[PDB]
Design a protein around this nucleic acid. Structure first.
Ligand SMILES: [Zn+2]
Lengths: 128, 204, 78, 60, 154, 99
RNA sequence: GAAGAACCUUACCAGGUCUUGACAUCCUUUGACCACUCUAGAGAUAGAGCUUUCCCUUCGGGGACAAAGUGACAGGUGGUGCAUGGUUGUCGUCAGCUCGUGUCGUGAGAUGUUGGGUUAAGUCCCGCAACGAGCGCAACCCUUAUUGUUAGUUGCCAUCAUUUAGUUGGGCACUCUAGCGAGACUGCCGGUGACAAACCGGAGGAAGGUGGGGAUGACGUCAAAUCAUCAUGCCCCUUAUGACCUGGGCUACACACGUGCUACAAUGGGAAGUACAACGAGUCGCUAGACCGCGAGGUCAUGCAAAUCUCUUAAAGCUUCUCUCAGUUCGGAUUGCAGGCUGCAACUCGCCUGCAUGAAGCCGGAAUCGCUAGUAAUCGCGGAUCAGCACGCCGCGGUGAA
């Protein structure tokens, strides 16, 4: 059988994508596109690399990710398509890279310092 | 009131503690037993003057050791004083004590007896400048790249303190591949207390 | 509390058990801050000590759910 | 009046809710660590002495 | 700030309307990132325009970009401490900033008893020459060349 | 296969060098060693101020790192059991044995 | 500071007391010490009895201290941070502060350290009567953003079967953990710029011009504060200021001010269902399943020394009606009742649930402050001191402006 393997790490949530040739779907925790997700499952957010490679496609997705909210682990969806197109098409990789599409966000929760309230929120300077 | 104690910076990076321990199920007992070791060989240190004191643990035995500066001051003649201090310690230890006594080779590496000796001449009526200068000169005649002093108290038999004591050579304080040493003593003849913030440096 | 066992101090109870069916006395010097009341205590006059100076109080039948120290405070408020 | 409260807590307690602990070399009643049986500031200082097993400085 | 210039972080368009400045209108009412209430009732308000005096939301959004458009702007640049400024030529960055801030902080000022009819009548006003945000554009036209009494020694 | 031991201490290098010593002695007399399993190293926290009388904000914190090792052995022999019941060196590191 | 005031903790008052005293040295009886219950007591305590039982001996004494009485007293949160040590704030992460040889000025002193452009920076280049050498700065230290190899359990689901579950057939396949490595260092190229630093743009790259963040604060500046951590000279006492008990209180309210929390509303609610982690804690400590409750909870009893198992399947969203604009399905102030749990006990002086009046608040005036991005603004989880006691603290994660 044919299946793919694409991992993705944003907002402390690894996301293994079992991409199979289909019509363009998702089984996230074996649940469909809004059996798990609210209306913030937008087109250019999720389906960005389909407009540059395999246009319009698409193929059906199997994935299991937890960590982050609805908008956080959806950010791990782009890494799955990135590593899938990395597996599939070497010549479209330059069109991916010039459109970005692979620059991992190195952002986590910022370190929260003592002496203050938060990572940056200093206390109310009640002078007088 | 602004500096950081340097021996706490270098600990857990290149140097090691006085404990090969994984303190499980008896924590405060060995803690305030090691403190009893410290308070009980405190009277044993006026003439013997060890520098580093290491603790290890056997199966049912206590394996500690001392690194003295002078060989025959505690080993005695045929093991007389050593067995006696084992018997004195075993009442505080409650466990089979089994020790070893190591003579330091090239014995002026210590920073402890440096502080003890400068506290000795400070408690034996010597003025402040030339004692510090002869300290750094006799450390240089042994060989050391930098020695600093930040002395305070009621200095030279007079009123309100200073922060003085001067140096030699280049000295990496703020680096981390440094291996610097530090000590603070209490020292007084009669006027309150005159502590000594001594510093050495040996070079990597 | 009271319904899972009345909380009445035992030797002070032994002071008031000695005069159960006897005449209503005037003064029993005590401390009177921990024991609550269950209704077999009616009629006495026991010196409630606040902490500085004891002030007595007599005992009616209505006292059912509190202690003796609820009437001599620690205030001297004026 | 400090040496009464050093020998005070070595008794068995009068009832169960008086079992409060403190340091042993010193006598701080506030901020003693029950997993250490040391007070606040002596943990910091004896940690800088290089004698407490384990403990290192923290940065991440 | 003090050292030199800085970037501006242009916004991405919507994957539904396909218009960038609509996202700029989204990202000024939305409190705590709550896209679920505020942005969807903005969708509902522009569909109220589509259902009453309107055909497509993009064209009427451009019509709102007509009738709110800040043509000028002043900025208090003192020299000797006094009230000194001049009607400066507005950047289309800062034009969109001023105009959509007029619309959003007048939707704050409007406050009608339905949480999207204030938005519906707000964009029926800002898209169709009415409401005091368009009259804020009128009053912006007013003080344009009215602080000019101290803005001709420049 | 009915032999398993645990190795728990502070650091990493003394633990896994002693683990390699006892893995050597185990697979010397027989064969079939399992993995020298790294455990995810539970970490502590403390939070201590710097001054005595005032100045709560001047924090100075400390933590703890405790690496742990699990060792299984497949297809044992009486000789590796004898090696694991009469050799618990080094003594500066503590182990947790089972079978 | 006080990282948990119901007694203790505790300094401060009322009552009940003592004086080699609980503490520190020793003699002495030489006892084995304490063990065991009764009377009254607020107890500190006043009064009794049982065995308590030499715990080594070349039979000597010392190895046991309740004890007894004594001496030199012990002792003191009584002053002295403006006699002290030490420790911590402070400019402030601020880049400043020095020395040797040569040379100038009669001499104190000067030249290095000045002039141009360069950086967050006394970092670097070119001109320098100065030629060379330092502490600082950068830097190695940790975390973390990417990957290779190694290691597969208590974790992981590649090859497929069973499934209520990934049970065990299956190995570490993906993942994950931690070990060694490779890694972002102006590393390469084009132009600007004297060819000098540097700058602007590329290529590769996950990370481009020190990736984000931490540890690390020079000389000194300020009689800053600490004798209430401890040491500590000087003046004071020691039948009391030292020590022991019961009740209190540091939680009271005629007012002013700093900080934290909640709504003041139609962006708020109710009914329904439906979601998504990380840091940890854990064997007299966390509770599987079931029962019974409006409920606080109780009951039978299981696991859990931890990658197994308990807190522990997090919240705002998502889709319907609603109060449809009011002191109101906004909100919950104080009060009577049912209780629940900790404790020796919850009037002083713990917390919580439910039932019942439904307070005020109907967007805050000068003057303020936090902050240049997964950050402000906002929503949840755990931990400390702790039998009980968080709008506080310390972290962790979720949504995410200008
Ligand atoms: Zn302490």
């Amino acid at each position: 059988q044919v299946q793919y393997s694409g991992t993705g790490r944003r907002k402390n949530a690894v996301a293994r994508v079992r991409l199979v040739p289909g019509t363009g779907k998702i089984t996230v925790n074996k649940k469909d596109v809004e059996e798990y997700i609210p209306h913030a499952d937008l087109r250019e957010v999720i389906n960005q690399p389909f407009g540059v490679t395999e246009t319009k496609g698409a193929y059906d997705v199997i994935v299991n990710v937890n960590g982050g909210g609805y908008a956080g682990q959806s950010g791990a969806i782009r890494h799955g398509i990135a590593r899938a197109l990395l597996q599939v098409d070497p010549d479209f990789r330059s069109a991916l890279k010039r459109a970005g599409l692979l620059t991992r966000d190195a952002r986590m929760v910022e370190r929260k310092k003592p002496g203050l309230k938060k990572a940056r929120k200093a206390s109310q300077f009640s002078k007088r | 009131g602004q500096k950081v104690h340097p021996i706490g910076m270098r600990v857990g990076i290149i140097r090691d503690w006085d404990a090969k321990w994984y303190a499980e199920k008896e924590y405060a007992e060995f803690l305030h037993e090691d403190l009893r070791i410290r308070k009980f060989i405190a009277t044993k240190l006026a003439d013997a003057a060890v520098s580093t004191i290491e603790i290890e643990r056997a199966a049912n035995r206590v394996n500690i050791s001392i690194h003295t500066a002078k060989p025959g001051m505690v080993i005695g003649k045929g093991g007389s004083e050593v067995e006696n201090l084992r018997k004195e310690l075993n009442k505080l230890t409650g466990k089979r004590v089994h020790i070893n006594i190591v003579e330091i080779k090239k014995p002026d590496l210590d920073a402890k007896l440096v502080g003890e000796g400068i506290a000795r001449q400070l408690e034996n009526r010597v003025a402040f400048r030339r004692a510090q200068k002869q300290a750094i000169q006799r450390a240089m005649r042994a060989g050391a790249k930098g020695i600093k002093t930040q002395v305070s108290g009621r200095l030279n038999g007079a009123d309100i303190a200073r922060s003085e004591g001067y140096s030699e050579g280049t000295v990496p304080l703020h680096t981390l591949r440094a291996d610097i040493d530090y000590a603070w003593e209490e020292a007084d003849t009669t006027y309150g207390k005159l502590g000594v913030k001594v510093w050495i440096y040996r070079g990597e | 509390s009271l319904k899972k066992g009345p909380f009445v101090d035992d030797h002070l109870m032994k002071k008031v058990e000695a005069q159960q069916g006897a005449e209503k006395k005037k003064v029993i010097k005590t401390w009177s801050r921990r024991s609550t009341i269950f209704p077999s205590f009616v009629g006495f006059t026991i010196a409630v000590y606040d902490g500085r100076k004891h002030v007595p109080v007599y005992i009616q039948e209505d006292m059912v759910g509190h202690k003796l120290g609820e009437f001599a405070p620690t205030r001297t408020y004026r | 009046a400090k040496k009464s409260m050093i020998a005070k807590n070595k008794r068995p307690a009068k009832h169960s809710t008086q079992a409060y602990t403190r340091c042993e070399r010193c006598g701080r009643p506030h901020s003693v660590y029950r997993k250490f049986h040391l007070c606040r500031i002596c943990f910091r200082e004896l940690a800088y002495k290089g004698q407490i097993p384990g403990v290192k400085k923290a940065s991440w | 700030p003090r050292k030199g210039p800085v970037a501006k972080r242009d916004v991405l368009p919507d994957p539904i309307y396909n218009s960038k400045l609509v996202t700029r209108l989204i990202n000024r009412v939305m409190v705590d990132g709550k896209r679920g209430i505020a942005a969807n009732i903005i969708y509902n308000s522009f569909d109220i325009i589509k259902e009453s005096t309107g055909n497509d939301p993009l064209e009427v959004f451009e019509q709102a970009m007509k009738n709110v458009m800040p043509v000028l702007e002043v900025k208090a640049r003192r020299v000797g401490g006094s009230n000194y400024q001049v009607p400066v030529e507005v950047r289309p960055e800062r034009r969109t900033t001023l105009g959509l801030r007029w619309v959003v902080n007048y939707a704050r000022l409007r406050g009608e008893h339905t949480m999207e009819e204030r938005l519906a009548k707000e964009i029926m006003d800002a898209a169709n020459n009415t409401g005091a945000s368009v009259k804020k554009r009128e009053d912006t036209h007013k003080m344009a060349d009215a602080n000019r009494a101290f803005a001709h020694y420049r | 296969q009915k032999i398993r031991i645990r190795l728990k201490a502070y650091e990493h290098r003394i633990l896994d060098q002693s683990a390699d010593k006892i893995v050597e002695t185990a697979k010397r007399t027989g064969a079939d060693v399992s993995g020298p399993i790294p455990l995810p190293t539970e970490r502590s926290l403390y939070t201590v101020i710097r001054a005595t009388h005032k100045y709560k904000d001047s924090r100075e914190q400390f933590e703890m790192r405790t690496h742990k090792r699990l060792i299984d052995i497949v297809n044992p022999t009486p000789k590796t059991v004898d090696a694991l019941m009469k050799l618990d060196l080094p003594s500066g590191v503590n182990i947790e044995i089972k079978l």
